[PDB]
Symmetry: D3
Subunit: 66 residues, 6 copies
């Protein structure tokens, strides 16, 4: 929704989005999306869900990128 | 023109472009392009040209993309 | 192979790949690839192999973009 | 909003987002973005707003970029 | 070292890799990688494995990306 | 140079660059730039300049990046 996005970009809440706030916001979103993708990928490799990739989980991932 | 393009990369003026000067140039050019693009987008949203994006301007922009 | 790669990624040598480890490795590898490509490009201009592009080399390159 | 977003990827209105609709939505969204950008760029070069870039306009623009 | 990859690129078996063979290979590999990634994302959201994202599954996804 | 560029973009030769012309050109130039880069890489691997990569050239390249 238009209103919430505005409030999030407007960090100093003065009701004017500056160029610097736009730039910060775009960088922040890009960072968040890249971190989300990497976690999604990690969780896909970590079959047994324990937070680590063992050598057998790894080996399976690696043969399968084909 | 040839000299001018070389001089732009050769930031310490020694008449030779080092590998670090190439890397720095490739970064600077990419950063300039991204600034230019972002500034252009910004200016397109900033309908009254006052250097800031107000909620009204922001709603008009959000609405006309999706 | 998978083995060597697992070892490379497992920087702390504890036999497990952590998410922090995956992040480090992805950043490392991205950086290496960029550096390889920029080196390959630089080497193709640096015709005498001395580690600098001189103006003559530059003009041979600027001259040839066809 | 999750419904708004869902209802948009779900092109055929069957309440199910297929893999093909994901792939199409991703492509569509990429296309629209690029077109919008190219529109802005063009407009920025076409100072007099006549719908064409003349060599005078192209020359200015070739200045900065 | 490199033999399997060279043979995979060298599609006509002449013991040479041509520019067109390299190009066809790079495109082929890029197409498969983009497919594997998008499939991975899809599958992570399709929790019941039925090949569709239903509204519950999607809301869990979109909610989970904050 | 600029006029050479402008004339190249002005496909219909009417002295004006249209929006359709700009679109046509961006796709063209994108394609050209991607070919040019792949070409530069290829040429760097093809040490003997016969226009083909033989196995000993390929192995050398592969080793250099491994
Ligand atoms: Ca503000
Ligand atoms: Ca695990
Ligand atoms: Ca220098
Ligand atoms: Ca304004
Ligand atoms: Ca104002
Ligand atoms: Ca470890
Ligand atoms: Ca040199
Ligand atoms: Ca559907
Ligand atoms: Ca004009
Ligand atoms: Ca061949
Ligand atoms: Ca499902
Ligand atoms: Ca024309
Ligand atoms: Ca050769």
């Amino acid at each position: 929704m238009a209103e919430a996005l505005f409030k999030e970009i407007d960090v100093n809440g003065d009701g004017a989005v500056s160029y610097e706030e736009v730039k910060a916001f775009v960088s922040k979103k890009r960072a968040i999306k890249n971190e989300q993708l990497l976690q999604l990928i990690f969780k896909s490799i970590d079959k047994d869900g324990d937070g680590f990739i063992d050598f057998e989980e790894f080996a399976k991932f690696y043969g399968s990128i084909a």
